């Protein structure tokens, strides 16, 4: 969905998609 969100938390990625394992991706897509 976007990126890795260890500096700070994703924004549009973290409605729809969510920030885990530093990555802000919907479980499954980038």
């Not at 994703?10 to 990555?23: D, E, H, P, Q, Y």
Request: glycine residues 10%; proline residues 7%.
């Amino acid at each position: 969905c976007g990126e890795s969100c260890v500096w700070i938390p994703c924004i549009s990625a973290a409605l729809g998609c969510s920030c885990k394992n530093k990555v802000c991706y919907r479980n499954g897509i980038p």
